[PDB]
Every structure is written in structure tokens, then in C-alpha cells.
Amino acid sequence: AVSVLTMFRYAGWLDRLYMLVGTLAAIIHGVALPLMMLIFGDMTDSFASVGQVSKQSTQMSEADKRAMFAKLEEEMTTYAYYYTGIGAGVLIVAYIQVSFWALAAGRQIHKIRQKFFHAIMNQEIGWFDVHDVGELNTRLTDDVSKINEGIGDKIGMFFQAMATFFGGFIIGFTRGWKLTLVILAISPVLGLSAGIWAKILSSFTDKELHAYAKAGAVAEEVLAAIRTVIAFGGQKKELERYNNNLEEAKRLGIKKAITANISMGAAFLLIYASYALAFWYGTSLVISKEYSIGQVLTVFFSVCIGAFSVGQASPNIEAFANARGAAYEVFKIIDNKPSIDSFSKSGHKPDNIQGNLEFKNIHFSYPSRKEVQILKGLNLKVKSGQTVALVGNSGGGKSTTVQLMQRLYDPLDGMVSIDGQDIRTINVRYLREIIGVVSQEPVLFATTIAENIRYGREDVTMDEIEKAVKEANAYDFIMKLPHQFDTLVGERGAQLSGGQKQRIAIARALVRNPKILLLDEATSALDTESEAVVQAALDKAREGRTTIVIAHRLSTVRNADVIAGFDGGVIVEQGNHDELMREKGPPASFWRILKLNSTEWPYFVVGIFAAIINGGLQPAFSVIFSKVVGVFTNGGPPETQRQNSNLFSLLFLILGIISFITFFLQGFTFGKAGEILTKRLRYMVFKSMLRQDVSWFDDPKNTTGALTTRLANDAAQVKGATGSRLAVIFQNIANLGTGIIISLIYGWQLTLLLLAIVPIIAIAGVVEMKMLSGQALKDKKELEGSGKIATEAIENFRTVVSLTREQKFETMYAQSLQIPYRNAMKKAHVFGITFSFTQAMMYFSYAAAFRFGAYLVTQQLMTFENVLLVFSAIVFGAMAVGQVSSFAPDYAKATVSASHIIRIIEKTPEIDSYSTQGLKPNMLEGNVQFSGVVFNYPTRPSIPVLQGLSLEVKKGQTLALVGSSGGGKSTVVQLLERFYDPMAGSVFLDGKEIKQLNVQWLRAQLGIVSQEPILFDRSIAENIAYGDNSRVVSYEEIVRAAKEANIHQFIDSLPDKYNTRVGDKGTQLSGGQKQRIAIARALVRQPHILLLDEATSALDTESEKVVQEALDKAREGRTVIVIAHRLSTIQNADLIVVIQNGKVKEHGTHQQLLAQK
Ligand SMILES: C[C@@H]1NC(=O)c2csc(n2)[C@H](CSSc2ccc([N+](=O)[O-])cc2[N+](=O)[O-])NC(=O)c2csc(n2)[C@H](C)NC(=O)c2csc1n2
Ligand SMILES: CC(C)CCC[C@@H](C)[C@H]1CC[C@H]2[C@@H]3CC=C4C[C@@H](OC(=O)CCC(=O)O)CC[C@]4(C)[C@H]3CC[C@]12C
Ligand SMILES: CC(C)CCC[C@@H](C)[C@H]1CC[C@H]2[C@@H]3CC=C4C[C@@H](OC(=O)CCC(=O)O)CC[C@]4(C)[C@H]3CC[C@]12C
Ligand SMILES: CC(C)CCC[C@@H](C)[C@H]1CC[C@H]2[C@@H]3CC=C4C[C@@H](OC(=O)CCC(=O)O)CC[C@]4(C)[C@H]3CC[C@]12C
Ligand SMILES: CC(C)CCC[C@@H](C)[C@H]1CC[C@H]2[C@@H]3CC=C4C[C@@H](OC(=O)CCC(=O)O)CC[C@]4(C)[C@H]3CC[C@]12C
Ligand SMILES: CC(C)CCC[C@@H](C)[C@H]1CC[C@H]2[C@@H]3CC=C4C[C@@H](OC(=O)CCC(=O)O)CC[C@]4(C)[C@H]3CC[C@]12C
Ligand SMILES: *SC[C@@H]1NC(=O)c2csc(n2)[C@H](C)NC(=O)c2csc(n2)[C@H](C)NC(=O)c2csc1n2
């Protein structure tokens, strides 16, 4: 499924030179940094040699030194020259690498995309029938971008990474071969620890995801069943179920958070212990007078940077692997030789042809469905100038003879010859342009009528092509509205009708001046008004050349003189009609609202204290590191070096263990707070949504899938704005402020210099990221601009290949892609320049910092201990701040947008939902006066409905209404339980307005039955118990409801009824019994008034009688309102009054029998 080192197969000599120079620059830039460490080591050795000042006899003599301080000055001047030279070299080389690699990638991608479109627009139609279209286009858009990203940036930087790895290891083995081995021994431990912690975290995350998805099942269930849940008024039970299920997800997320934070703690402890071991074993050697402090530093740093690089070049291999995976398919689409080329110039040129088509034993079956044999041989011959008509159900599926005419497929064992010569030898393009074909649905292109006609053949003299357009149905529909020119017809803009689309397609076909014409479904589902003109145009085109017509309409059949119509694959004679039946027939959150939401003010003091401690440790690390270097640079008594070294190594170890315990505690408290916040947010969001109203649920913006994703994968992001985003800011301040205060105390000069320089590189990186993101957005904009013509061409491939215009779309694609070709190159150059400037600023800042430090030391202001402390507390503090900011769950987004969205959902208005504001009368007469009411759906108010209704209900009534279930035109049943709020018409129940009535009381008296009885995973007995939600639930009434609904005989099988859950579609229930238990659940509440509807029950044809008897018993027991399209049920209905828009108030028989069929 991959292909290695064939990608560059499309690379020219210039591209190969670009790649070679880029690789050389990557090698040089990778080797640069170990040389930086070597020069730093020599610098430290020189300072240690000069600043020893251990001789008290010469401490004052000769004005102290003032002679070899000049040597130090000269050595530091030449080292500053080394630093600035390597900086300039990197400044050139980084650009030479990135710009050249990205230019080569851009050229390769442009060639790949252009020739890939050329190849895909070359394959035969059968390939398109076998494969898909949407996935194919998304492949065109996505795989090319994957290849670009990979074989540009990532292969550009992988060579840098390996060059740094080799350079660092050569430096180490060259200078400190004793220390390098022990550093090599301790290095894999960090990687192994990281890997094992990552594996544990991944396992915990997967377990938590499954445990929560167990709850997500019921989350999705009672939101897809939201209508039934609201109607039955039992949201409390689902709230309880969701809380119980989330009780486990919270507990597993606790372990996940603990694992992640203790993983980071171990990652810090191992690093600190590595520093401890390295400097312990280096100090021992230095005291043994083997290695100098410079030789320890330049070897340790070189080895660690080498290991870091070889570990950091994982993504540049992952991206290359992904690019290879995409490139395999992209390349297999190319190089695929088609049976029909339509591009090769091979083929004889017959001129002055007649067109005596013929067919002899044409066997063909669609490769999409090879098992089904459509065509089983035909024998037929025609003469030029004689039209042939085919009549039947379809032309072999759908105009199979038409499809095979233009080489769109390949016949099996069949032979066809236009003039005695097989169509295999003739040129494909020549055959295509001598055959005219009109589609049943004439697709056009989002372009003017001028070019739409131009795509007929060669756009020639515009006056000549207009004269070609001068056929019938012109001069009226082409000038009045179309402004005589530049119509720009398309789905979007200047949209026309099929009556004119067919005519313009016919005009386009006549422009080509075909020799043989094919007609297929000229007026397939077209309006009869547009008829009798398109037929006239077709006839006047027919009088010229031979044509074959297949159409359902009999008018063209009559018009045609010769008719060989048949069906079933068996040929029938031409000319006569014998034995041919002819029946006529969102704003950003303020971030204090989130903290107020996280009301647990405990669990945060401990976290803040731990974060402050951990942030303050890194400056203490810099202090101890500076002291370690100072022990040898500004050395004193040789016998105290051992004690100082042991103390400082023990200090590293103590710092490591205290940092590890700091993350243990901080992670415990912050993860606990985050998980409890997530559980609270999920519970409250579910409560708010179940309180929410039917109108809000019906809003198509709140699609159930997106809503469930918001409940699941968005309510857990807020963990990243009150948690990590509170810990990281305090850690960063306790790091940087503590570093800068110590720097100000000791080396305020160098402190100000470095604190003025560091913001420059910081803002340079920030602006680099901004401009890169902006350029990527713009490039995606033009890429989608090209993708519109790409998809417009690919979607209508059948038509564009039926027409001979094939290279036109390739040329248009090239023209559309030309601009992104230059945009990519300009973006590549900009990225190269900014990368080179950021690296050059880093190295030049390093050089200037040590040059100023050397000046100050020569001036005898601060020692090298202080210089190194200030430097390593200002720069390495900022780098650690950047790393800690990077290691955060993204406060910018994923957290900021999700948090505000769910805050809006939580603070949503309550639209006539459950509340204490309600009247609950103790009597219920069961009378509703549904008259003088008008209502429109809030989701689609543009279509006014439900106008002029007068209804009256009494006790024992069996009111039967007729309303369209399509679009829910009969929404009276919906309005009864206040699914929607009436705007003008008032409804009075028992002489009381429902507005003052309690919503729960109203919904506790309405036995509604839906069309499709959606079912939960709950057992059958408790499903029946669902009727009496928020009421007394017990047993031996479910049995009574079952007896009433006549389900006892069916539930005799597995009579337990308690474990018979319909889970996994287990214990399956068919439609009839599911409806029967739906009415059972309606009845178990024992409501005074019932609503019913039966739509698909009539499909059962067996349970109809049982469900009708159950409904009969229910309605004789109590008043029932029925609305259904089934006239059979109402025929049965007895005490009824048909009403339609208030027009009828009695039996259909009583007035005109409009009600009866
Ligand atoms: C988890 C993650 N780590 C890194 O992103 C990272 C990459 S590099 C590195 N750290 C070097 C060692 S390099 S690890 C190592 C250590 C030893 C050896 N070896 O050859 O023995 C090799 C390697 N190696 O694989 O490169 N770190 C230092 O110099 C150093 C001194 S204080 C300090 N870090 C503080 C405690 N950490 C942070 O502020 C911080 C924030 S986020 C984070 N760390
Ligand atoms: C060692 C340092 C100090 C001197 C660096 C010299 C470079 C400026 C040279 C080295 C190899 C050269 C290149 C070698 C080959 C070409 C191919 C050539 O590609 C084209 O044909 C595009 C022409 C166009 O602009 O239309 C453009 C210049 C380039 C990259 C050369 C430009 C300049 C390069 C990078
Ligand atoms: C000033 C020189 C001696 C030292 C520094 C070298 C690089 C910083 C510059 C100088 C000349 C530049 C080249 C001059 C001209 C071109 C052609 C131009 O590309 C094109 O117009 C077409 C390239 C293609 O698509 O093949 C941009 C890249 C390139 C190679 C440039 C790449 C970057 C180069 C090598
Ligand atoms: C990261 C994993 C894979 C290995 C980490 C090893 C470190 C945790 C060990 C290795 C050597 C140890 C050091 C070896 C010797 C000493 C001296 C000793 O300290 C003293 O004060 C004793 C002085 C003396 O009696 O000589 C004990 C602690 C210390 C710093 C040890 C601290 C812990 C170190 C750095
Ligand atoms: C006399 C001494 C004590 C003066 C101390 C100066 C402090 C009051 C200033 C100097 C630099 C500031 C820091 C510069 C950088 C940042 C930005 C920010 O760090 C981030 O990475 C934020 C990331 C994000 O939330 O997007 C948090 C505050 C912090 C640490 C600042 C906290 C306040 C600091 C330490
Ligand atoms: C546009 C971006 C990449 C910033 C570019 C900055 C560099 C051009 C500057 C910043 C700091 C400068 C350095 C700061 C201090 C010194 C010491 C200074 O003194 C000498 O070396 C003495 C020279 C003499 O008199 O012979 C001049 C060179 C050097 C390395 C400077 C070289 C030029 C550097 C690298
Ligand atoms: S060790 C690999 C490489 N390290 C250096 O380049 C380097 C030279 S000096 C030095 N690090 C001092 C000892 N480092 C710090 O003070 C320090 C504090 S925080 C920090 N470094 C962050 C964690 N470092 C990195 O992310 C990092 C990437 S490569 C690298 N260090």
C-alpha cells in the first residue's frame, strides 16, 4: 500500500538540484549547533583558566592581572567572531535549505496535481461506475496536500535532525568519550519511561472513552426520542440515568488525569537525575585532573542535543509515511491505461459517411452489477436517413444501446459498424464528435450561454454559431430575460427551468452538426406546457440526419416512421404496432464566568501553591547549575571541590524529587477539580436540554449528532480553561518573575540587555506563526476556488465525455491552478526568510549576551558565575516558559469556544417548561374547544399553515380528523400538549385557558400515541411503567394494561417481562406488537383523553384487527381523538365528525361523499 522513492519520479533536473542543495544546507545547519556547543565549552575553559586568581602573591602585584585580562579580551573577541560567523552561516544556510526544499515540493505538487487531473479525466466511464465520485474528489483535494506537506517540510527537516544527531555524537566521542558513554547509558531510560507512561495513559483513555460511551448510548437515545420524552413528561428518570452512568466516567477520568500528571512528574524527575549523574561523573573527572569544565559542558550538551534530535525526528517520518500512503493511490490512478483513450491520434479518417448502423449479437452487462446480465444479443440493421424508435419499459435498463453507441462501454462478443467498419478502429474523438447525444436531464455548467453553446464543438465565428442557435425556440427565451448575451446560467444565479434547459442542450447538440443523433427521454417528468415545442425542434433537427429515439411518450412514437420497440432484451420487428399494447394511462467568554462555574474554591489553593513551587524550582535549578560551573571556573581551595560537587549533585536529586512530588500533588488536585467540573457540566447541560422545548429541538441547527458531540467531546474541554490554564499561568509567573528578580539582583546590566533582546525573538516567532497561518488560509482559499471547477467537471463526467470537449476542462484547470502555483512559491520564500531570521536572531542574541558578559568580566564587575547565572536564568527560563505553554490543552480554542457554547446552552431561556407557575384543577371534564386558532411552525414560518379551524370535543367522543402527515400538517395533536406555543388562537379545556394550567398536569392527562413508537433499551415491564412517570409506580397494573391492550398472548413467551429488554434488537418486537405495547404504555397512565395515529400499521395486514380492537376498547372506555390517513379505520370509527379546515362538522356520508374514495 506504499511506494518508496518513486514520488520523485516526476522531478526534473532543476528539482533534483534543488533537493541536493537543500540536503547539503540541512546537513550544514544541523552540524552548526554542536559547533556552537564546542565554542561554548572552549569559552568556559578560557574563563576558568583566566579567572582562577588563586595566587594571592600576584593578586595585587602588577595591578592584579591587567596583562592577561587582555588575553581574555582577545580570546573573547575571536570567540564573538566565531559566534557571529556561525550565525551568518546559519542565516544563509537555513534559507537555502527551507526555500529550496519548498520550491521543489511546490513544483512537484503542481505537476502531480495537473497530470493527476489529466489522468482522471482520461479513464473510461466504467471505472467511474465502479468507483465513487465524492470520495474521489476529496481524494484529489486531500492526498495532494498530504504529499505537499510531507515531501516539502518534513523531508526538509529530517536531514537537519540526522545531521545534528551525527554532529553531536561525533563531538561527544571526540572530546569526552568517558562521559559520553555514561550519558549514553542514562539516555534510553527517559525514552522508556515516556513510552510506558504514554501506554498507560492511552489504555486509561480508551477505557474511559468506552465507559462514557456506555452513557452516550442513552444520551443519544433520549435525544432522538425527544418528542416522546417531552410528551410523556418523565425527564427526571433520564437525568437520573445519565448521572448514574457518568458516575463511572468521572472516576475513570480521575485515573486518566492522575496518570498524565504523574507522567509529566516522572519526565521531570528523570531529566533532573540525569543532570545530577552527568555533573557528578563530570566533577569527579575534573577533580581527577582529566577533563576540564569546558570539556564536560561541551560533551554533555552535545550528547543531550543529539539524543533530543534523534528523538525529535519522529513527525518528519510519520508525515513521510502518510505522504507515501496517499501517493500510492494517486500514482495508481495515473499510469492506468484505459481501454478507450479518447486522446490517441490513431484511427482511420472516413469522410462523406452515410451512417448505416448495425448490431449483431450484442451481449453486455453493467460492470457495476456484473452478476445481472442486461443485454443478451441483438440483430438489427438500419439505412441512412431513416429514424428508428424503440418502445418499452427501458432501453435495456436505461438506454443501453445509447450508452454503447459512443464507446462509453465495451461490448462483449458483439460487433457494430457504422459503415461496415467496427467502431474499435475509428478514432474515439472523431466518433464522439460525429454522434449527437442529448441527456434525459440536461446538466449545464456555471457559465454563460455563449460558452455553453461554445462547448458544442470548436467555438467558431460567433455570428456563425449564433446562426446555428437560430433554430426553433430561440429569439424569445434567449434575449428577453437572458439580456441577449452573458446569461451565466447555473444552479447558483440566473437559474432557469427544465423546459429551457432541454432546448439549450438541443441547440448545443445541433452546434456540433452530428451525423447520427440519439434521443433519450426528451420530456422525462417535464411539464406538458413546455411540450409541443421541444418536439417540434427535435423533429426539425430530425429531418436532416438519421436518429434513434427512445422515449416513454407516444407522440414521438407516432411521429417516427420505423419502430423496433421491445423489452426484456428480446428484439421485436420494426414498422408495425402488432401485439404492442398501448394503454393511454459566539462571543468569547470573560473567563471569570468559568471560574464562578467551578465553584469548588478548595482543590485550587493546593494546586496554586504546587504550581508556584514548580515554577520557582527552575530558577533554583539555574542557580545550582551556575554554582556548579563556578566551582571550577571561579575556583578556590582544591580540597573543597569534592564536598561542593557532592552537595550540588545531591541538590539536583532533591530538586528532582521535590518537583516530582509537586506534580503528584498538583496533578491530583487539578485533575480532581477538572473531572468534577466536567461531570457537573455534563449533568447541568443535560438538565437544561431536557428542560428545553420542542421548538428548540426542532431547530435544524441543533442536529442531534452535533448536539451529542457538543455534550460529549465539548463538555470535557472546559477542563482546559479553569484547570491547566490556571496552573500554567501561575507556573510561568513563578518561573519568569523569580528568574528576573535574581538576575536584577546580580547582573542587572546583562539582565536588562537580555530582557530587551528576548522579546524581539519572541515577537518574531509570534509574527512568523501569524503570517504562516494567514498564508495557509489564503492558499486554501484559492485551492477551493480551483476545487469548485474540479468538482463541477467531475460530477458531470458522463455529459462532458459524451461531448468531445475534454482538453478544454484540463486547460481551464491549469489556468485556475496557475495562480496557486505562484502563491506557493511566494509563501515558500517568505517562510524561508522568516525561519532564517528567527534562527539568526537566536544565535546573534547568544553571541551578544556573551560578548557583553566578557566585557563586564574584563571590567571586573561580575564574575563568570554571575554572568552564567543571569544568562541561564533569562534565556533558559524563557525557553522553559515556552515549553510549559506548549504543553497545555489549548486555552485559545477547543476550550474557549466550547466553554462559551455550553454556557449559552446552560443559560438558555425556559420556554413554557416545567415550573411552579401552574394551575392544577382537581376536576377534568375532558372537553376541549379547539376553534379560532391559527399557527405556523417556528422552524419554517415561511409556509403558513393551520388556518381556520373550529373543533368541539365532548365526553365519549371519537373525533376523527384528516390532516397531512407529510410535513405534519395535522399538528393539532402536537399543540394539545404544548409542544409549540400558539401565537393568536386560544385553546380552552373545560372552560379554562391552558396558559394558566400547569404544564406537567396537562401532559399527565394526554395519552398520546406517535406514528413510529420509538423504543429505549429499558425492559418491557419498566417501559410500560414509563406511563406513570412522576407518579406512583408499582406492579399488577402493568398486567392489567397488558390485558387491556391484548398483549398477554404474545408476552406469554418469556413471561418474566423483567429481563426482556429490546437491547441490541434482542427480544425483537415486530411493528404490530410494538404498536400494541405503545397503546399499552399510553393506557397504563390512565389518562382521561387519548390521541392516536396509525400510518404503517396497515402494512402489517394481520395485526390491524388486533390493534383496531384495542383502540375500540380504549375509546369505549374513554374519550379518544383520532387522526389518520387510513379511511378504513375511520370507516370503523363510529362517534366521529370529519373536519377539514372547519368545512365539515358531521359524517362524510351525511354530506357530499368527498370523504369517501
Ligand atoms: C517534558 C518536557 N521536556 C521537554 O520538552 C524537553 C526537551 S529537552 C529537555 N527538556 C532538556 C533535557 S534533554 S532529555 C535527555 C536527557 C539526557 C540524555 N542523555 O543523553 O543522557 C538525553 C536526553 N534527550 O533525549 O535529549 N531539559 C533541560 O535541559 C532542562 C533543565 S530544567 C528543565 N528542563 C525543566 C525541568 N523542564 C521544563 O521546564 C519543561 C517544560 S516541558 C518539558 N520540560
Ligand atoms: C557558497 C555560497 C557562499 C555561494 C552561494 C552561490 C548560490 C547563489 C548558487 C549555488 C547553486 C545555484 C544555483 C544553482 C542552479 C539554479 C537553478 C535555476 O532554476 C531556474 O531555472 C529558474 C530560472 C527562473 O528564475 O526563471 C535558478 C538558480 C539556481 C537555483 C542557482 C542559484 C544560485 C545558486 C543557489
Ligand atoms: C546573493 C547570493 C550570491 C547568495 C545568497 C543566495 C540565495 C540567498 C539566493 C540568491 C539567488 C537566489 C535565486 C535567484 C533566482 C531564483 C529563481 C526563482 O524561481 C523562479 O522564478 C522559478 C523557479 C522554478 O520554478 O523552477 C526563485 C528561486 C531562485 C533559484 C533563487 C533562490 C535563492 C537564491 C539562490
Ligand atoms: C536517572 C537514573 C536512571 C539514574 C540516576 C542516578 C542518580 C539518582 C544518582 C547517580 C549517582 C548519585 C550520586 C553519587 C554520590 C553522591 C554523593 C553523596 O552525597 C554526599 O553528601 C556524600 C559525600 C561523601 O561522603 O563523599 C550521596 C549523594 C550523591 C550526590 C548521589 C546522588 C544521586 C546520584 C546522582
Ligand atoms: C522586580 C521584579 C520582581 C520584576 C518582576 C517582573 C514581573 C512583574 C513580570 C516580568 C515578566 C512577566 C511575565 C512575562 C510573560 C508572561 C506571559 C504569560 O505567560 C504565558 O506563557 C501565557 C500564555 C497564555 O496564557 O497564552 C503569563 C504571565 C507572564 C509569565 C509574565 C508574568 C509577570 C512577569 C514575570
Ligand atoms: C537582523 C537580525 C538577524 C539581527 C542582526 C544583528 C547582528 C548584525 C548583530 C547583533 C549583535 C552583534 C554582535 C554584538 C557584539 C559584537 C562585538 C563587537 O566588537 C568586536 O568584535 C570588535 C570589532 C573591531 O573593532 O575590530 C562587534 C562584533 C559583534 C560580534 C557583533 C556582530 C554583529 C551582531 C551579531
Ligand atoms: S539538552 C538538549 C538541548 N539543550 C540545550 O541546548 C541547552 C544548553 S544549556 C541548557 N540547555 C541549560 C542547562 N538548560 C536550561 O536551563 C533549561 C531550563 S528549561 C529547558 N532548558 C527546556 C525544557 N529545554 C528544552 O526544551 C530543550 C530542547 S533541546 C535542548 N533543551
Author numbering: 32 to 616, 689 to 1260
The authors write:
P-glycoprotein (Pgp, also known as MDR-1 and ABCB1) is a prominent member of the human ATP-binding cassette (ABC) efflux transporters that removes a large variety of chemically unrelated hydrophobic compounds from cells. For Pgp and ABC transporters in general, ATP binding, hydrolysis, and subsequent release of the cleaved products (inorganic phosphate and ADP) fuel large-scale conformational changes that ultimately result in translocation of substrates across the membrane bilayer. To address this fundamental question and overcome the dynamic and transient nature of substrate translocation, we tethered a substrate molecule covalently to specific residues along the putative translocation pathway of Pgp and utilized cryoEM to capture Pgp structures with bound substrate during various stages of transport. In conjunction with molecular dynamics simulations, our structures trace the substrate passage across the membrane and identify conformational changes in transmembrane helix 1 (TM1) as regulators of substrate transport.
Four single-Cys mutants of Pgp (Pgp335, Pgp978, Pgp971, and Pgp302) were generated for crosslinking, and mutations were chosen near the two previously reported QZ-Ala binding sites. Based on the appearance of the yellow DNPT byproduct, Pgp335 and Pgp978 reacted with AAC-DNPT within minutes, while Pgp971 and Pgp302 did not. Importantly, Pgp335 and Pgp978 retain notably higher ATPase activity after crosslinking than the respective apo-Pgp mutants in the absence of substrate, suggesting that tethered AAC still acts as a substrate and that Pgp335 and Pgp978 cycle between IF and OF conformations. In IF conformations, TM1 is a long, straight helix. The non-crosslinked molecule is bound in a position that resembles the one previously reported in a crystal structure. It interacts closely with the covalently linked substrate, which is situated further up the membrane. Both ligand molecules are oriented along the vertical axis of the protein and positioned side-by-side through hydrophobic interactions. The uncleaved DNPT group of the non-crosslinked substrate is evident in the cryoEM density map.
